[PDB]
Each structure stands twice: as structure tokens, then as C-alpha cells.
Design a protein around this ligand. Structure first.
Ligand SMILES: [Mg+2]
Ligand SMILES: [Zn+2]
Ligand SMILES: [Zn+2]
Lengths: 1270, 109
């Protein structure tokens, strides 16, 4: 019911037009190529802007001007013709053109494969001659009347040929009599007979051409009779003169036509069922090229068979007209007029159609008429898709006219260019400054921005306080900025959350919601902790503010996207509100311990007591505020309000030390007590030195064991104490605090002698150039590491630079090595090393040549960072477009399958060394089965969350192989069940039943781009990940095994050739073209000759294509390979991604199965279908007899897998929008509106998060025990 | 750099869409040649012409037989008439009979 357009959609179905549907849509028939009057600027009558068709131009204004009142409504005016209504109906009122002669579509002819040509079984170039009026084609030919006229008109044909032969022999006899006359009138005179033989030869040649021309017209008679006997439908007849011969002699007993109406007659007299059965018989019985052709036609043939849709849609009798508001006839201030280029094409089609109608009522020869038909057909094609066939129609400046299809095609259509994004109201942006007194959920706001933002709210409030009695007075008061608006503005702005966003928005934490508070000034203040999540520096970066309006949207920005409820990154579960550089330096200086400092506790006795002890931290604070104590001494306080560590509390109170009350002694510092009071009351005492890893562990454990509000208040107190002790710590950089190592000249002389010897040996010609450069590279790398060792040995611990480095605040040791020491080696523009190298440090200052050498590497890094940024954006786009449908649907899939987990493999001496990859592989995943240690009891039952205490229990019990339940093995239809996915890391508990895990996975994978350095011919960087998800064959193709047993290591000349000894008794496996660009595989030691191999052991050393490993070891070990292969790349940069994020992508790759046996089930060999359909394929058709359908697992790249989707509306957004529509149009492919890409386009609620029907039909009512209290 | 202004040729009002106290409406019915009704809601105080253009393609007449007037239609420029304006009857008939005599002597022999 797409007439009144109710707000309740179920499906969107695209079909195929008919002339009846078009004339039912239309509100008239445009018949004049007129738009406006040149002087009065009013629309014309029966033109492209005809008001009678496309409604009026002003609100309830008829054209003469009589009826101008809203009391008139829907009343057509007999004087002017129009119906009184709003001017908004010019947006959606349709017109149609009437066509004198039919014209076919351009999409069903020109777009290869030609769908009409496949339907009617013709060549496309030989269909071009039909539809462009250059060849005649016979529609239908009689058979019974032709059958008796075969005999009768063959008698007539023989009689006509006999009369023709009589004419021929009469002409030959007359020419022979003239030849005998030439004989008589040459022979009678006795002269030179050479000229007398010339007239005889001319007469002979004349007789020859007479009989030759007679033979040619006899051949013409034979040809017309032969072709009449060969008369069949779908026969092209070239040479319309010969067609006219067929008309004058054998013009009856058949019907022929020419052109689009001939195609229409052909399709009308075309029953598809007989050709469908014939194609079925051909593909069932035969084989080969004819069977492949029959299948390729049988696609669209069976589509029309299952369809109730007519096959008449290719021809067209009435082009529809787009409403005039979509092609605006705007004018500017200054008499300049602008149109949108469709009016020229429409005007052209109108002119051609009117001229053809005039000629067909006049009566004209067929050359004129068919030339007019041809240019009309070309005009319609130029309207629908300008530039496909021949040449595009251009205009002024020779730009081709943007047709209808270019409003959808490409990057300027209504599938991308208005579906990337749109500008919004209630927005704003400014520069940002640090707000280090704010609480975590707060953010600043300048008043000259917030007044503009909250303008309607403050208008309503200051009307309600009678400062301005009407809205216009309120608006003028706000514009003049009278001083009452601020006291109104605070009350209207309290507890009204706004959003913040910094472009570019990489991942999910890029948009966070904050409660505003007013800031005098011009810059948005910001909490200093969230700059880590926003990736915002303060070099002048600009954030943008939006504003939610509805009660629903304010609820979402208050509960979901609030800044205090996003502490853990969803990629890995590590915190992102952890204190960074400056406060980390503060806490490091606070909690370090210095021996030899003032007022230390010593037990020096026999004369006087210890003089280090203190009764309470209050007394310690008083003493430190005096001159006696330092913060970082070592004392023995008696705490009372801090819970002791577990060992000490077990020693003293056993288990019942309720640390609110009791008292105990501790030999800490003061600073660790002062820092440890910031942590909550239940938390055990720490007593360590607060390196950044330790702070990450503390905040991670705190967020696991405590609520988020406790975590937020704790980390805010941490920020305050961190800044206050950072400014006391005396971190300064001065040139007396950058010490050169005092051994650098000795080190450089010792390496310089070796370099000089190598250069001398190349000077004598003892080696080649690349050996020289390699030896120099090795010498200077050893020298650089030696001087770095000397520097780190020399520097004392309490230096500012090494303190900043060692705390984990920022930087690494290489930057200190360059700042004092040596720069090392600098690369080339190509990427190789310069063998010079730099031997100076930035404290001592470089010289001119060294600065010139350094400039290459600096500029190269500067350009390639932006290049890597663009490529990471591209990768994120592809992954989002693949996995934008995996959302949580059920609660329990209820399977028993699952993957296994390595989990701290057993040592050969025998112990459980903990495996280093557990937090990204084993943490936060539910257990598929139970775990039992040495056939005793179970330790952890099915369904447990598998956190740290379960991990410790399994490790103490001494087991490695658990069988976790996970996605990959999820048995739901679409999307995954909640109990498989495990603990969502952004909450620390189980996921809900609406979470968009696919988009979370895609953003968490694609965000740590721009930190993937490749190396210094096998890919090892970001493009290695890019070819992995595309699953293409890699460059460094190291092959794998195909059977186990011993192997024959074997090398030929300059490239190797290894055969494999089989143990199965089959053919001996032989690998042939092993080039010498690789090395041998090292396993367990080098690959030996006669060494025992596996069925899938990699032969060479490098990479294997996954298609091979799918073919050998099946569908399981590809995923175990593909997870571990990608995850290795991120571990090379110290970046942690949990493996369930990659697990969603690899699940989407293996959805499909190829077809090799269509058998008796409906398919085509070599085609790809979903497994879940293929499961129900051989559960329905195998009832009452199984039918052959052989399926193999196929692994496909992400761009290939996204393209072969099913919701056509989403699929049109990628490429070939003309092609994507034009075959879904044939199949009547109704969409489902179930993904997330399509619901954004048509503006309804997304079916994920607060859009599902569990969470949208919630009824809210007071309880009845509280009803009576009201 | 380049920011312009402009408006389409038309003004916009602001009323309320009440749906009760409308103008009194007569509904008229027309009909094309091919049996196509086109219901035309006029005013109640409105003259009804016998013919009216419709979306069907032609001027559909009234469904009444009250005004059946087919009168004023003719082709003003026929080739025969503009032949008659320049050529006389005896000259044209002489040419006709000469060509008839020629084709009689050609087909007959
Ligand atoms: Mg910046
Ligand atoms: Zn009017
Ligand atoms: Zn599941």
C-alpha cells in the first residue's frame, strides 16, 4: 500500500513496469516542449511544468485566481484547469509521455549479458540491427498454406524459370546472329584479320555477359525460392530490396516486421513454457557448450517461469515523467535561470515524438518514417542512460548530460552521496583545552555557543517567567543578549547531556556523552583522562558538539554513552581511563622508595630506640609538613583504616580482620600509604612501586570486582593526586641533564678500524659492492647497540629523562639514544640503508651532510603516515560492509560443539608454564564442556565465565585442553546466540540480546592501523593483513604437505625440487618449482632429508595460501590457522585484540558452499550458495528419494563475500547499481529490511540495540501498591 | 567564496488543514471514447461543460447524452483541395484520361 505511505513497513519489493501501471500512475499526458513564458515567468499549458498535471504553484491558488481560499480544497477549476491544493504536490505528481510507436528499454538490451538476447536466443549485435532499424526479421510464417503452395508455387516457379530461360536463349540467339553478322561483315573484306577478330571477340564477350547476367537472375530466382522454403521465425533478412522481392512474389504465407514493434510482436507470440521444457531436457541430457548456454538462458527463463510477471516489460509504450520539483526551474536574484539538464532530454523526446506523430498522420515513405523511429529510439536511450551506446549527448561546454541513471550510479547518486552523511542542526564545534578540575562525567561549554545551542529551550523558559511576553520578544532579547538569559540558561542547561565527537571517528569510543557546565571563555574544556580515548592532543584539534532532543535520545545519552560508563575498551578489555603520562610520573615519584633518605627507620639500639616508627599517618603527615620526614623514606606506621595484604591478614587475624576496626604495623613508606588511601576501603594494601603496568593491573582488577561508579571516583582521585605530585617531582630538562657517554670516541675508533679494513678490502677488489654495503651495515648496527649499552650503563637512575622513560609515561630508549649517543643509520628514499652513517648526537649537533641524510627518512615517514591512514580507513570500510549483520539474536544456541584451547602447555621437565597468549585466547569465553583433572572430579562446570579464579583453579589442577564454546560453532540461523559470544568486554558481564557485535568487531580490528610498521620479499605489515582478509594467494607461497611420512629433501640447480615419500601407497607427492628466493622450514631444527612430515606441514619457509590448506585439512584448521596468522601481526606491535573479534569475520568468510553436482536439485555447477539453504535443500528434496547435490567448502575474500549478499538494496551501494537493479528487477526480488545498512537508508529504526521488538513494545505502568499512595 | 540565493517561482502560505467546513462540492463524471470514467469533483456552484480533458489521453466527453454535438471538425488543407485551387477540372480530367489511355495501351498492349 504505497499510496498514503503509512509508517509501518514489512518488505520493499521491486518489480517491472507495465504501460497500464504507468498510465495509472500518471496525472495527465505532457505534449508540448514548453516550460515557462519568457516575460511573465509563469508555467505553460500541457508542457513540462503544466500546472494542470503537476498541481499548482502556490498554496491553494488556482491559476485564473478566482478560488484562493482554503474552504476550496480538491476542487478542479473549469476555467483554469487546475485542482486547488498545496504546492507540495509538485514533489510527487507523476506524468507520462504517450508514444506513437513502441521503443524498447536500454537496460535489457545493451548491458552485457543482453537479457532480451538471452531470452529470445539471438546474438546481441544481430539484435542491434533489429532494434536500430537496419535489418528485417520475420515474425511468423504459415506452414499448411505454405505446404500446399510449396507444390503449386514450385510449379509456378518452374514455369517462370522456363519463361526466363526462353528469354535467355532468345537473347543468346539474337547476339549469336549479330555475331554471325560480324563474321560475315569481317570475312567479306580481305584485310588484316586481327581487327576482324576483335568484333568477333566482342560479340562472344557480349554473349558471355548476356548468359552470365541471365544465370545471375536465375540464381536470384533459386535464392528467393530456397529462402521461402527455409522460412522460419527469428530469421534475419538483410537486403531489404531482396525482402521487397519476397514481398512481391511470396509476400503471403508469412508475416514480417521490423524494429521495436517487431520485437513486441515476437515476444507476444512467445510462450516460454515450451522453451523452458526444452532447456530442461537439454541440461538434463546433453553436455557441453550448448548445455552451458542453455543454463545461462535458463536462469532468466526459469525466473520468468516462477514469476507471475509478464515478459512484456522490455518494450515500452509510455515513458513516465519525473515530477518537476526534482528537476527545479529555479531562478536567481538577477534573472539567471537554472535547470537540472533533464528538461533538455525530455524536450528532445517530446519533439521527436510529436514529429513522428505528425508524419504518421501525414503518410510518408518508409525511409523518412524509419529514420524518425531510429532517432526517437536513440533519444529514449539517451534519456535513460546517456553514454552507454555510441556517444553521450552533450551540451554547452561539451559535458554529457547527466541522465536518470547518473542520479543513482557512482559516487554522486542517492545511494552513496546522500547516504555517506548529512549535515545536522543543533550542532557546533570549537577548539579544546584541558579541564583538570572537572569530574569525569562533566565537560565545559562556552556560553556564546551554549546560548545558541539551547535557544528554543531558553525561549520557552523566559516566556514562562514573563521576561518576554511573546516569542518574537524572546528572540530579540536573546539576540541582544540581555543579562537575564544567563540565569535562565543555567536552569535550562542543568542535567541535559550533550555529545562530543572528534573527526576522524575511528572506533566506538569516539563519541561520548557529557553533562555540560558553563565556562566563561571561548574553548571547550575537557577532562584530561578521556583524551586517550578521543586520541586528542591539544595542538589545536577541534571537537564537534551535537545535542539530543527527544526523551528517548536523552535517555540513550544518559545511560549508554555516558563517559563514566565507558572505562574499558571493547577491543581488549584493558582500561582506557587509566592515568597517562603526567599523572603517571607523579605517582611514580610518590610511590618510589629511596634508601638513605631523611628520617629513615633504623633499629640502631643499645643507646636509643628506633626513631622511625609513627603511631598514625596523621602523625606522619605532621612530621613531613615539618622539616623532618621525606615522603619516600622507609618507616613503620601503625595503620588502622587500611586493609592489610592477604598473607599478613591471614597471619594475624586468620580470616576475620574487618579493617574498619583493627590495627596493625607495616614497614611501608609514607607515600604508599598516602596513595593507598585513594583506593576503596575493601581493597587490600598494595605496597609496590607504581609502574604503569602495575596501575593497569590495579584498575583492571578493580573494575572486575567493583561497580563502575566506584571505579570512576577512584580514578578521579588518582588523577588529582597524580597532578599534585607531578608538579612537586622536579622533572625538568636542561642541558646539564643530558650527559654524553664518556666512551664514545673509543667505541667509534674500534668500530672505525673494522669499517676501514672492509673498505680497504673492497678497494683491493676482494669483494663486491653489495657485500661491502652488507658488511658496513652489520658493523654500524653492532656499533649502535654497543653505544646504547654504554649510555644506559652510564645514566644514573634519578635523572629526569630516564625517569620519564622508565616510568612508562612516554617514549622508549631509542629516542634517548638519539638525543645523546648516536643517530645510527638513516634510510633511503627507496628504503635501503645509507652506509655512511651518522656518528653524532642532537646534543652535540649534527653537521650539514648528516642533516641532509636525515631529511630523507623524515619526509618518507611524514608522507607514509597519511598514506597508511587512508588505507586503514579503506580496510575498516570493507570489514564493516561485510560484518554489519551479525547481531545477537537468541540466548542459547544449545549445541555441544566448540573449539579447543591450548592453555599453558606442559613442559618437558614437567610443569605448567603459563602460555603468553591467554588474555587474547582463553579469557572471557564460556566453557562448552566441563574440565576434570586426571579422571577425578570436575573443577569448573559448563557455562562458567572463565575468568581469573577459574583459570587459576584449572592451572593448579594441571590441565591444558579445555573445549570452550564459541561462535564459529553457533547454530542459530542469522546472527549468534548470546551464550556463545561470552563476556562482552565493554561491560564485564554477559552480552545482551541486541548488541551489534559485528560493528564492534570491525571497528576493533580496523582501529590499530597507523601503528603497523612493516619491516626495515614476503609481506609482514598492514598489507599482509589486507591480503589475508581478501584471502588471495600470497607472494611468498611456501607450500605445505599433502601426506605424512618421510620426505626426500632434494635440490637441483638454482631452484629446488622436493618430492614426498607417501605412506598411503598412493602416487608419490612431488613438488617442483621451489625457487631459491626462500629458505627451508625449521621445525621442533632444520628440515632434514628423510624427516617425518605431517599431512599439512609447511614445506618451505614462508606463507601458505589458505585455499590449499582448506583443500587438505578441511574446514576446521583453516580457522585455527587464520586466527593465529592475523593475530601474530598485531602482537608484533604490542597491540592486543581479543580473538572473538576476529572470530566473527572468519565465520562470515565460510558461509558458502560451491556446487559441483546440480544433480536433481535446481542448481548450476560452479555456483555458490549458502550452506543453510543447502542444508534445507537436501532435507526437502531428499524426502521421497534423495537427489544429487554435492557441496564443497569454499573460502572467499571479504569483497567477494559482501557482493554475493541477498538484500539487494544494500548490495546497490557498492558497485554496478545499474546491473544490481536490472536482474533483481527480473526476479521480483523483494527485500526483507533485516540488516543494518538498509534501515539507515529508508530512515526507519535499525533492528539492533533499542530497535528490536523485545525492547520496543515495553509497557510502563505504576505498581498498584504505589497507585493507592497517590 | 560563492554563496548565492534564490527561490522557485511561487509563494508559500501557512494555514490549518481543517477537513469539515469545506466548499460545497458537486461530483461530475466524464467519459472517454474507450469507456473510461473520470470522476471530476467540481464545486456545487459550478457550470459543468460537456467535455473535459482527462489523463486517458483525449478530451473525454460527459457521461450524459445531453450535449452530443460533433459538428466543428474538418481537415482544412487536403491535397485534393489545394490541387483544385491551382488546377482546373478539365485539365485534371484530361491528364487523368491521358494516363488512363497510356496505361490501357501499356497493360493491354
Ligand atoms: Mg592534534
Ligand atoms: Zn482557474
Ligand atoms: Zn551459539
Amino acid at each position: 500500500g504505497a499510496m498514503l505511505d503509512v509508517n509501518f513497513f514489512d518488505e520493499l519489493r521491486i518489480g517491472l513496469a507495465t504501460a497500464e501501471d504507468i498510465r495509472q500512475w500518471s496525472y495527465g499526458e505532457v505534449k508540448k516542449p514548453e516550460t515557462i513564458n519568457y516575460r511573465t515567468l509563469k508555467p505553460e499549458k500541457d508542457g513540462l511544468f503544466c500546472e494542470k498535471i503537476f498541481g499548482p504553484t502556490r498554496d491553494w491558488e488556482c491559476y485564473c485566481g478566482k478560488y484562493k481560499r482554503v474552504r476550496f480544497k480538491g476542487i478542479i477549476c473549469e476555467r483554469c484547469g487546475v485542482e486547488v491544493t498545496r504546492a507540495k504536490v509538485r514533489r510527487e505528481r507523476m506524468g507520462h509521455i504517450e508514444l506513437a510507436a513502441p521503443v524498447t528499454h536500454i537496460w535489457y538490451f545493451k548491458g552485457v549479458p543482453s537479457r532480451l538476447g538471452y531470452l529470445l536466443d539471438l546474438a546481441p549485435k544481430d539484435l542491434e540491427k533489429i532494434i536500430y532499424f537496419a535489418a528485417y526479421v520475420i515474425t511468423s510464417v504459415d506452414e499448411e498454406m505454405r505446404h500446399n503452395e510449396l507444390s503449386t508455387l514450385e510449379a509456378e516457379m518452374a514455369v517462370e524459370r522456363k519463361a526466363v530461360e526462353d528469354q535467355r536463349d532468345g537473347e543468346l540467339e539474337a547476339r549469336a546472329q549479330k555475331l554471325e553478322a560480324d563474321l560475315a561483315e569481317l570475312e567479306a573484306e580481305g584485310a588484316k584479320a586481327d581487327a576482324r577478330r576483335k568484333v568477333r571477340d566482342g560479340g562472344e564477350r557480349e554473349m558471355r555477359q548476356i548468359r552470365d547476367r541471365a544465370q545471375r537472375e536465375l540464381d536470384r530466382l533459386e535464392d528467393i525460392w530456397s529462402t521461402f522454403t527455409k522460412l522460419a521465425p527469428k530469421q534475419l533478412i538483410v537486403d531489404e530490396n531482396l525482402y521487397r522481392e519476397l514481398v512481391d512474389r511470396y509476400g503471403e504465407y508469412f508475416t514480417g516486421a521490423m524494429g521495436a514493434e517487431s520485437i513486441q510482436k515476437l515476444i507476444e507470440n512467445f510462450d516460454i513454457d515450451a522453451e523452458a521444457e526444452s532447456l530442461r531436457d537439454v541440461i538434463r541430457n546433453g553436455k557441453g557448450q550448448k548445455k552451458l548456454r542453455a543454463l545461462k538462458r535458463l536462469k532468466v527463463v526459469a525466473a520468468f517461469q516462477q514469476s507471475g510477471n509478464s515478459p512484456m516489460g522490455m518494450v515500452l509504450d509510455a515513458v513516465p515523467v519525473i515530477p518537476p520539483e526534482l528537476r527545479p526551474m529555479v531562478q536567481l536574484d538577477g534573472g539567471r535561470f537554472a535547470t537540472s539538464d533533464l528538461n533538455d532530454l525530455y524536450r528532445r523526446v517530446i519533439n521527436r515524438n510529436n514529429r513522428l506523430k505528425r508524419l504518421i498522420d501525414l503518410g510518408a515513405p518508409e525511409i523518412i518514417v524509419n529514420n524518425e523511429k531510429r532517432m526517437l529510439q536513440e533519444s529514449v536511450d539517451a534519456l535513460f542512460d546517456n553514454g552507454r551506446r555510441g556517444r553521450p549527448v552533450t551540451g554547452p561546454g561539451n559535458r554529457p548530460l547527466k541522465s536518470l541513471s547518473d542520479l543513482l550510479k557512482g559516487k554522486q547518486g542517492r545511494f552513496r552521496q546522500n547516504l555517506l552523511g548529512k549535515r545536522v542542526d543543533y550542532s557546533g564545534r570549537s577548539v579544546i583545552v584541558v579541564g583538570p578540575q572537572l569530574k569525569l562525567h562533566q565537560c565545559g561549554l562556552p556560553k556564546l555557543m551554549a546560548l545558541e545551542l539551547f535557544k528554543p529551550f531558553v525561549m520557552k523558559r523566559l516566556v514562562d517567567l514573563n521576561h518576554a511576553q511573546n516569542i518574537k520578544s524572546a528572540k530579540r532579547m536573546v539576540e541582544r543578549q540581555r543579562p537575564q538569559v544567563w540565569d535562565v540558561l543555567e536552569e535550562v542547561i542543568a542535567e541535559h547531556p550533550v555529545l562530543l565527537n572528534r573527526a576522524p571517528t575511528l572506533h566506538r569510543l569516539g563519541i561520548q556523552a557529557f553533562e555540560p557546565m558553563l565556562v566563561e571563555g571561548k574553548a571547550i574544556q575537557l577532562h584530561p583522562l578521556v583524551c586517550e580515548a578521543f586520541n586528542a592532543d591539544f595542538d589545536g584539534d577541534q571537537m564537534a558538539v551535537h545535542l539530543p532532543l527527544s526523551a528517548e535520545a536523552q535517555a540513550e545519552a544518559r545511560i549508554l554513552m555516558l563517559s563514566s560508563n565507558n572505562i574499558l575498551s571493547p577491543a581488549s578489555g584493558r582500561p582506557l581511563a587509566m592515568p597517562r603520562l603526567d599523572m603517571v610520573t607523579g605517582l611514580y615519584y610518590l610511590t618510589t622508595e629511596v634508601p638513605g633518605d631523611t628520617g629513615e627507620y633504623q633499629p640502631a639500639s643499645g643507646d636509643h630506640p628506633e626513631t622511625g616508627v609513627y603511631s598514625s599517618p596523621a602523625e606522619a603527615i605532621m612530621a613531613a609538613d615539618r622539616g623532618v620526614l621525606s615522603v619516600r623514606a622507609k618507616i613503620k606506621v601503625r595503620l588502622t583504616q587500611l586493609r592489610p595484604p592477604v598473607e599478613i591478614e591471614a597471619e594475624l587475624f586468620g580470616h576475620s580482620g574487618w579493617q574498619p576496626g583493627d590495627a596493625w604495623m607495616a614497614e611501608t613508606t609514607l607515600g604508599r600509604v598516602m596513595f593507598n588511601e585513594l583506593l576503596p576501603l575493601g581493597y587490600p594494601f598494595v605496597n609496590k612501586q607504581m609502574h604503569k603496568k602495575v596501575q593497569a593491573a590495579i584498575i583492571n582488577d578493580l573494575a572486575e570486582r567493583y561497580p563502575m561508579i566506584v571505579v570512576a571516583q577512584t580514578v578521579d582521585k588518582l588523577k588529582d593526586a597524580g597532578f599534585y605530585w607531578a608538579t612537586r617531582s622536579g622533572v625538568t630538562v636542561s642541558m646539564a641533564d643530558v650527559l654524553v657517554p664518556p666512551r664514545k670516541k673509543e667505541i667509534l675508533d674500534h668500530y672505525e678500524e673494522r669499517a676501514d679494513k672492509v673498505e680497504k678490502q673492497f678497494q683491493r677488489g676482494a669483494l663486491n659492492h653489495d657485500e661491502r654495503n652488507e658488511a658496513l651495515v652489520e658493523i654500524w648496527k653492532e656499533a649502535t647497540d654497543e653505544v646504547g649499552q654504554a649510555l644506559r650503563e652510564h645514566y644514573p637512575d634519578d635523572n629526569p629523562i630516564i625517569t620519564i622513560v622508565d616510568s612508562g609515561a612516554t617514549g622508549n630508549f631509542t629516542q634517548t639514544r638519539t638525543l645523546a649517543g648516536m643517530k645510527g643509520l638513516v634510510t633511503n628514499p627507496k628504503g635501503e640503508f645509507i652506509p655512511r652513517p651518522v656518528k653524532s648526537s642532537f646534543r652535540e649537533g649534527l653537521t650539514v651532510l648528516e642533516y641532509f641524510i636525515n631529511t630523507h627518512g623524515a619526509r618518507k615517514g611524514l608522507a607514509d603516515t597519511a598514506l597508511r591512514t587512508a588505507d586503514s580507513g579503506y580496510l575498516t570500510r570493507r570489514l564493516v560492509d561485510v560484518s554489519q549483520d551479525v547481531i545477537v539474536r537468541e540466548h542459547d544456541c544449545q549445541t555441544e560443539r566448540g573449539i579447543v584451547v591450548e592453555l599453558a602447555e606442559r613442559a618437558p621437565d614437567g610443569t605448567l608454564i603459563r602460555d603468553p597468549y591467554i588474555e587474547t585466547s582463553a579469557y572471557a569465553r564460556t566453557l562448552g564442556t566441563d574440565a576434570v583433572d586426571e579422571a577425578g572430579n570436575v573443577i569448573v562446570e559448563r557455562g562458567q565465565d572463565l575468568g581469573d579464579p577459574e583459570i587459576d583453579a584449572l592451572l593448579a589442577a594441571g590441565i591444558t585442553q579445555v573445549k570452550v564454546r564459541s561462535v564459529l560453532t553457533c547454530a542459530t540461523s542469522t546472527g549468534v546466540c548470546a551464550t556463545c559470544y561470552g563476556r562482552s568486554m565493554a561491560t564485564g558481564k554477559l552480552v545482551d540480546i541486541g548488541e551489534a557485535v559485528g560493528i564492534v568487531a570491525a571497528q576493533s580490528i580496523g582501529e590499530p592501523g597507523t601503528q603497523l610498521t612493516m619491516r626495515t620479499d614476503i609481506t609482514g605489515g598492514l598489507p599482509r593483513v589486507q591480503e589475508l582478509f581478501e584471502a588471495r594467494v600470497p607472494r611468498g607461497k611456501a607450500p605445505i604437505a599433502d601426506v605424512t611420512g618421510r620426505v626426500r629433501l632434494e635440490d637441483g640447480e638454482r631452484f629446488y625440487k622436493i618430492t614426498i615419500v607417501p605412506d598411503d601407497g598412493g602416487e608419490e607427492v612431488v613438488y617442483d618449482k621451489i625457487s631459491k628466493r626462500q629458505r627451508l622450514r625449521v621445525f621442533k631444527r632444520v628440515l632434514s632429508d628423510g624427516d617425518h612430515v605431517e599431512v599439512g606441514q609447511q614445506l618451505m619457509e614462508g606463507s601458505a595460501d589458505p585455499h590449499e590448506v582448506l583443500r587438505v585439512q578441511g574446514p576446521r584448521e583453516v580457522q585455527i590457522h587464520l586466527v593465529r596468522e592475523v593475530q601474530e601481526v598485531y602482537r608484533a606491535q604490542g597491540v592486543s585484540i581479543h580473538d572473538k573479534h576476529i572470530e566473527v569475520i572468519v565465520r562470515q568468510m565460510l558461509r558458502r558452499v560451491t556446487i559441483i553436482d546440480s544433480g536433481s536439485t535446481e542448481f548450476l555447477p560452479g555456483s555458490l550458495i549458502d550452506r543453510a539453504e543447502f542444508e534445507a535443500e537436501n532435507r526437502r528434496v531428499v524426502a521421497e528419494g534423495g537427489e544429487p547435490a554435492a557441496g564443497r567448502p569454499v573460502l572467499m575474500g571479504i569483497t567477494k563475500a559482501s557482493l554475493a549478499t541477498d538484500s539487494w538494496l544494500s548490495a546497490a551501494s557498492f558497485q554496478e547499481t545499474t546491473r544490481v537493479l536490472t536482474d533483481a528487477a527480473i526476479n521480483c526480488r523483494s527485500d526483507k529490511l533485516n540488516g543494518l545498512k538498509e534501515n539507515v537508508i529508508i530512515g526507519k529504526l535499525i533492528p539492533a540495540g533499542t530497535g528490536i521488538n523485545r525492547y520496543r513494545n515495553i509497557a510502563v505502568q505504576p505498581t498498584e501498591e504505589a497507585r493507592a499512595a497517590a | 567564496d560563492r554563496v548565492l540565493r534564490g527561490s522557485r517561482l511561487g509563494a508559500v502560505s501557512y494555514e490549518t488543514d481543517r477537513n469539515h467546513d469545506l466548499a460545497p462540492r458537486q461530483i461530475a463524471r466524464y467519459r472517454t471514447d474507450n469507456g473510461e470514467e473520470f470522476e471530476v469533483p467540481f464545486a456545487d456552484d459550478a457550470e459543468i461543460p460537456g467535455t473535459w480533458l482527462c489523463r486517458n489521453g483525449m478530451e473525454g466527453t460527459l457521461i450524459e447524452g445531453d450535449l452530443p454535438e460533433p459538428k466543428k471538425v474538418k481537415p482544412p488543407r487536403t491535397h485534393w483541395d489545394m490541387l483544385l485551387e491551382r488546377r482546373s477540372i478539365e485539365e485534371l480530367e484530361e491528364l487523368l484520361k491521358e494516363r488512363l489511355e497510356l496505361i490501357r495501351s501499356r497493360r493491354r498492349g
